[PDB]
Design an enzyme around this catalytic site. Structure first.
Site, PDB file in Angstrom:
ATOM      1  N   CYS A   1      -7.164  -0.411  -6.565  1.00 48.81           N
ATOM      2  CA  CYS A   1      -7.727  -1.642  -7.103  1.00 48.81           C
ATOM      3  C   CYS A   1      -7.989  -1.491  -8.593  1.00 48.81           C
ATOM      4  O   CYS A   1      -8.862  -0.718  -8.997  1.00 48.81           O
ATOM      5  CB  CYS A   1      -9.019  -1.993  -6.375  1.00 48.81           C
ATOM      6  SG  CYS A   1      -9.763  -3.491  -6.966  1.00 48.81           S
TER       7      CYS A   1
ATOM      8  N   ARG B   1     -12.090  -2.741  -9.836  1.00 47.41           N
ATOM      9  CA  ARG B   1     -13.326  -2.141  -9.345  1.00 47.41           C
ATOM     10  C   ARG B   1     -14.463  -2.014 -10.353  1.00 47.41           C
ATOM     11  O   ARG B   1     -15.484  -1.392 -10.041  1.00 47.41           O
ATOM     12  CB  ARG B   1     -13.025  -0.746  -8.791  1.00 47.41           C
ATOM     13  CG  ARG B   1     -12.061  -0.731  -7.627  1.00 47.41           C
ATOM     14  CD  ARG B   1     -11.814   0.690  -7.170  1.00 47.41           C
ATOM     15  NE  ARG B   1     -10.845   1.358  -8.025  1.00 47.41           N
ATOM     16  CZ  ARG B   1     -10.631   2.666  -8.032  1.00 47.41           C
ATOM     17  NH1 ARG B   1     -11.325   3.460  -7.233  1.00 47.41           N
ATOM     18  NH2 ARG B   1      -9.712   3.177  -8.835  1.00 47.41           N
TER      19      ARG B   1
HETATM   20  C1  HEM Z   1     -12.576  -9.296  -8.575  1.00 51.20           C
HETATM   21  C2  HEM Z   1     -11.353  -9.191  -9.096  1.00 51.20           C
HETATM   22  C3  HEM Z   1     -10.302  -8.262  -8.464  1.00 51.20           C
HETATM   23  C4  HEM Z   1      -9.127  -8.017  -9.034  1.00 51.20           C
HETATM   24  C5  HEM Z   1      -8.639  -8.572 -10.392  1.00 51.20           C
HETATM   25  C6  HEM Z   1      -8.385  -7.126  -8.177  1.00 51.20           C
HETATM   26  C7  HEM Z   1      -7.124  -6.631  -8.451  1.00 51.20           C
HETATM   27  C8  HEM Z   1      -6.313  -5.915  -7.591  1.00 51.20           C
HETATM   28  C9  HEM Z   1      -4.869  -5.866  -7.632  1.00 51.20           C
HETATM   29  C10 HEM Z   1      -3.952  -6.592  -8.642  1.00 51.20           C
HETATM   30  C11 HEM Z   1      -4.460  -5.076  -6.653  1.00 51.20           C
HETATM   31  C12 HEM Z   1      -2.986  -4.779  -6.334  1.00 51.20           C
HETATM   32  C13 HEM Z   1      -2.646  -5.683  -5.153  1.00 51.20           C
HETATM   33  C14 HEM Z   1      -1.175  -5.958  -5.122  1.00 51.20           C
HETATM   34  O1  HEM Z   1      -0.522  -5.873  -6.197  1.00 51.20           O
HETATM   35  O2  HEM Z   1      -0.670  -6.265  -4.018  1.00 51.20           O
HETATM   36  C15 HEM Z   1      -5.619  -4.592  -5.943  1.00 51.20           C
HETATM   37  C16 HEM Z   1      -5.643  -3.753  -4.854  1.00 51.20           C
HETATM   38  C17 HEM Z   1      -6.709  -3.648  -3.984  1.00 51.20           C
HETATM   39  N1  HEM Z   1      -7.966  -4.225  -4.151  1.00 51.20           N
HETATM   40 FE1  HEM Z   1      -8.722  -5.243  -5.755  1.00 51.20          FE
HETATM   41  N2  HEM Z   1      -9.167  -6.843  -7.070  1.00 51.20           N
HETATM   42  C18 HEM Z   1     -10.362  -7.535  -7.197  1.00 51.20           C
HETATM   43  C19 HEM Z   1     -11.376  -7.522  -6.252  1.00 51.20           C
HETATM   44  C20 HEM Z   1     -11.379  -6.771  -5.094  1.00 51.20           C
HETATM   45  C21 HEM Z   1     -12.365  -6.797  -4.027  1.00 51.20           C
HETATM   46  C22 HEM Z   1     -13.597  -7.739  -3.993  1.00 51.20           C
HETATM   47  C23 HEM Z   1     -11.976  -5.906  -3.092  1.00 51.20           C
HETATM   48  C24 HEM Z   1     -12.656  -5.520  -1.760  1.00 51.20           C
HETATM   49  C25 HEM Z   1     -13.912  -5.835  -1.485  1.00 51.20           C
HETATM   50  C26 HEM Z   1     -10.765  -5.266  -3.544  1.00 51.20           C
HETATM   51  C27 HEM Z   1     -10.062  -4.271  -2.877  1.00 51.20           C
HETATM   52  C28 HEM Z   1      -8.749  -3.874  -3.072  1.00 51.20           C
HETATM   53  C29 HEM Z   1      -7.930  -3.046  -2.187  1.00 51.20           C
HETATM   54  C30 HEM Z   1      -8.357  -2.405  -0.840  1.00 51.20           C
HETATM   55  C31 HEM Z   1      -6.713  -2.913  -2.738  1.00 51.20           C
HETATM   56  C32 HEM Z   1      -5.530  -2.110  -2.155  1.00 51.20           C
HETATM   57  C33 HEM Z   1      -4.733  -3.047  -1.249  1.00 51.20           C
HETATM   58  C34 HEM Z   1      -3.478  -2.419  -0.677  1.00 51.20           C
HETATM   59  O3  HEM Z   1      -3.344  -1.152  -0.702  1.00 51.20           O
HETATM   60  O4  HEM Z   1      -2.618  -3.214  -0.187  1.00 51.20           O
HETATM   61  N3  HEM Z   1     -10.433  -5.825  -4.760  1.00 51.20           N
HETATM   62  N4  HEM Z   1      -6.738  -5.123  -6.546  1.00 51.20           N
END
Ligand code: HEM
Ligand code: HEM
Ligand SMILES: N=C(Nc1cccc(CNCCc2ccc(-c3ccccc3)cc2CN)c1)c1ccco1
Ligand SMILES: N=C(Nc1cccc(CNCCc2ccc(-c3ccccc3)cc2CN)c1)c1ccco1
Ligand SMILES: C[C@H](O)[C@H](O)[C@H]1CNc2nc(N)[nH]c(=O)c2N1
Ligand SMILES: C[C@H](O)[C@H](O)[C@H]1CNc2nc(N)[nH]c(=O)c2N1
Ligand SMILES: [Zn+2]
Lengths: 419, 413
Positions: free
Chosen positions: A117, A120
């Site tokens: 992510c 974070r």
């Molecule tokens: C608040 C703004 C946030 C942004 C800008 C963001 C951004 C991102 C992006 C761009 C990815 C790559 C996903 C992809 O390209 O398919 C990612 C992965 C991920 N994010 Fe964040 N995220 C945010 C909030 C959160 C929240 C609230 C959570 C959980 C409570 C979270 C958990 C995760 C997880 C678990 C992954 C890995 C997913 C996977 O392996 O398929 N994110 N994030």
């Protein structure tokens, strides 16, 4: 024992000790690295279904221990009773129940530990909706609608997760069959092409096969397919006044709006598994806001997705004879410009990849100063366009798996014996 | 035991058995991945025996002569030499085979579809820096080939005791100089400022211009390195212009056509070739994204964005992104116009996927470093982006080695 990471622009070095607390395998060995495998490992923390006591308790004792150390109360009265309390529940129910504070701590920490992510830096500003009282698909639909509506907040997006009841024996699972709460349908055509979003063809067919009446357009919001306590899933239509959508236009090319493009504002990941002290929450939809590249680089521009580059190039009048004109690159930029400009115009939260990547560098520094480390997956952190002109491309990163965590899980149709 | 990698764009699945033959570290542990770490005296008689056996065995296997009369005689020969001399000498056939395979095994190289077409210059008879300068001039002239570039490597005498190393002190054979100014600004290429000081100290009188070809600094047999000026007629250069923006030529930009990497180590059967310059040709983004737009480099985004009247107030206008594309278009248009060999990143990655498939078919796998194969711009619209890759260290290989001014103990005055 340390490990140093260095940033080759700024020469900042960071000293990682947190990785000593890594629990699961990454997939790599000293003789082979798997850091670009999608699902590298299958090292889980407890066996497939209903664990014995000596399997589940050690995980529980770890999580509770970690939580009470977090609040400087290790070995305190409350902590010792809590251990004894979790022992009794496991002994009499083969599971146990998280306190409301333990549940909030864990969700925030699974986000914190999400090595992939880039977002974070917000990890501790997460709103947690406890839905562990839910019992039916209708109840799930109620909880999800409130989630969507709170998180959308008329466009000033807010991060939230809604946590449904944990897995018990493996047959009574709660599941959102949608991979995200708001995705568009994809339609197999007679002439072999694909209308809508090709990622979701299979899911769109399960919906139609489950009685959904498809509008057969290009941006049809998909129904929810909610499954409660192991029963057959059930279709619900999200009230449209809850689905915020941005029409994509361009600040320069007036013809851009005539491509008839829109995207939804709320990314709500709803097919992953949240794991805390050996408890498995198989339905934990979480949502925050988009980085612009996600819509404009991947959703619009992958070959197996909307694949709109060819169109945007044509209207730009680009030499598509050969690749060396870089016509894909050019169109790709004008698109992400258009996407950013549209969300910002409609005052819907969105972050660009320069701001996001810079944020994450700052988060890294914070985490190393106050925590001795911060797991990061370079392959996923680097945005899928303009990599080297962002600060993360030059940042070395250590990747390791900490608990609590979000995990992948099988799609429910591979595993659901219907009724 | 087998391993699978998937292409998530095409759904092709390949089965890697070759990973079983690796025996060097990756830096990763079973609980930590170092996949993005940039970089995670000499061998005794006992350590050399098995290393050499592994290489000789692999060579003879490669030519369908494993366990043959010539195979066993060569193996016994290598032993006599390590016993007598504590080292051994590669046949010419083994030297070519080894150098070709080190390129084939370079997990970070996207150009490996060309691996088997490599011209090897044996320079193991060399004894002086003047000798090295001659060899390098012939390398450059052969490789440049009036713009129709040809891959080649020149191999200098292997290491012995570590005291008599052959070294090219340049990182490439052709780079531009960098000069820090009193006011803190930098003229030329900021990457090379340190090497420039070293040359200037060694007696080089610099033009103090923006595209001064640095002099060769050549060390032979553990002696102090010596300065030589590459003859200007051998340095093919490309003036950078843009096919649509006529103002682009006024930036005054040029680049050298021949990437020739000279600071690495070539390891074959336990022998280390500390001086082994190799060259091929450029992918556009190496000059265009990295050499001009990296902030620690020529850093010309702001000037290009200005001339484009881009809104440089807010990142979210994506001016950096937009300018970067045009610069890379110019680089490709310039080389193609002057009929100097170059490959764009789409063509390059496409070929690498083809090469990877073929390598899994006829060899059982192909070690690759996703973090290096993916181009530094437009990654997700090249097919390597969606290609899963296993990384492991086959040998012969190319290897990093410390900079020689960090370890050389000087001789004169
Ligand atoms: C608040 C703004 C946030 C942004 C800008 C963001 C951004 C991102 C992006 C761009 C990815 C790559 C996903 C992809 O390209 O398919 C990612 C992965 C991920 N994010 Fe964040 N995220 C945010 C909030 C959160 C929240 C609230 C959570 C959980 C409570 C979270 C958990 C995760 C997880 C678990 C992954 C890995 C997913 C996977 O392996 O398929 N994110 N994030
Ligand atoms: C024929 C055309 C070639 C092309 C288009 C090409 C392309 C590239 C590129 C773009 C890189 C990344 C360089 C960087 O980002 O610093 C690379 C790395 C590398 N290349 Fe190739 N290359 C070619 C030929 C060769 C040859 C002839 C050799 C050796 C015989 C070679 C060995 C390597 C090695 C060892 C690396 C990794 C360098 C490192 O670890 O720093 N390449 N290649
Ligand atoms: N901003 C956001 N975005 C975001 C964040 C996390 C995750 C995702 C979606 N990530 C799915 C990528 C993926 C994962 C697994 C597989 C897969 C499927 C079957 C078997 C094995 C693996 C395929 C894909 C498709 N690329 C988006 C966001 C959403 C919520 C907060 O923030
Ligand atoms: N087409 C080509 N190009 C190419 C190929 C291989 C290697 C390179 C240069 N690669 C340098 C990257 C690098 C590596 C290590 C460090 C470093 C510095 C200090 C300590 C440790 C490591 C720094 C850098 C600069 N980024 C270019 C080419 C050359 C010959 C044939 O084809
Ligand atoms: C820290 C990080 O590994 C480093 O910046 C890497 C990333 N990938 C790269 N990829 C290529 N081709 N060349 C590079 O110099 C780098 N640098
Ligand atoms: C093969 C490769 O690992 C895979 O396609 C990954 C690469 N990096 C990614 N990075 C992000 N953010 N999202 C992705 O889906 C992927 N896909
Ligand atoms: Zn690894």
């Amino acid at each position: 024992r340390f490990l140093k990471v260095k940033n080759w622009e700024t020469e900042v070095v960071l000293t990682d000790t947190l990785h000593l607390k890594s629990t699961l395998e990454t997939g790599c060995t000293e003789y082979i690295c798997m850091g670009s495998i999608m699902h590298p490992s299958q090292h889980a923390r407890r066996p497939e279904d209903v664990a014995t006591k000596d399997q589940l308790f050690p995980l529980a004792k770890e999580f509770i221990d970690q939580y009470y150390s977090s609040i400087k109360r290790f070995g305190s009265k409350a902590h010792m009773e809590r251990l004894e309390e979790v022992n009794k529940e496991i002994d009499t129910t083969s599971t146990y129940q998280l306190k409301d504070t333990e549940l909030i701590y864990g969700a925030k920490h699974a986000w914190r530990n999400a090595s992939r992510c880039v977002g974070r830096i917000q990890w501790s500003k997460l709103q947690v909706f406890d839905a562990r009282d839910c019992t039916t698909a209708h109840g799930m639909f109620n909880y999800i609608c409130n989630h969507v509506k709170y998180a959308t907040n008329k466009g000033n997006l807010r991060s939230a997760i809604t946590i449904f009841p944990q897995r018990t024996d493996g047959k009574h699972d709660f599941r959102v069959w949608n991979s995200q709460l708001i995705r568009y349908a994809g339609y197999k055509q007679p002439d072999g092409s694909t209308l809508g979003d090709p990622a979701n063809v299979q899911f769109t067919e399960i919906c139609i096969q489950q009685g959904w009446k498809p509008p057969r357009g290009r941006f049809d919001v998909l129904p929810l397919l909610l499954q409660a306590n192991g029963n057959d899933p059930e279709l619900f239509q999200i009230p449209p006044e809850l689905v915020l959508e941005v029409p994509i236009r361009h600040p320069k090319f007036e013809w851009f709006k005539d491509l008839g493009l829109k995207w939804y504002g709320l990314p709500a990941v709803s097919n992953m598994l949240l794991e805390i002290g050996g408890l498995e929450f198989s339905a934990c939809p979480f949502s925050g806001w988009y980085m612009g590249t996600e819509i404009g680089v991947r959703d619009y521009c992958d070959n197996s997705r909307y694949n709109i580059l060819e169109e945007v190039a044509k209207k730009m009048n680009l030499d598509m004879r050969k690749t060396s004109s870089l016509w894909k690159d050019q169109a790709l930029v004008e698109i992400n410009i258009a996407v950013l400009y549209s969300f910002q115009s409609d005052k819907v939260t969105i972050v660009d990849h320069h701001s996001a990547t810079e944020s994450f560098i700052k988060h890294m520094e914070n985490e190393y100063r106050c925590r001795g480390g911060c797991p990061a997956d370079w392959v996923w952190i680097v945005p899928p366009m303009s990599g080297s002109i962002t600060p993360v491309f030059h940042q070395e990163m250590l990747n390791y798996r900490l608990t609590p965590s979000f995990e992948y899980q099988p799609d429910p149709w591979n595993t659901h014996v219907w009724k």
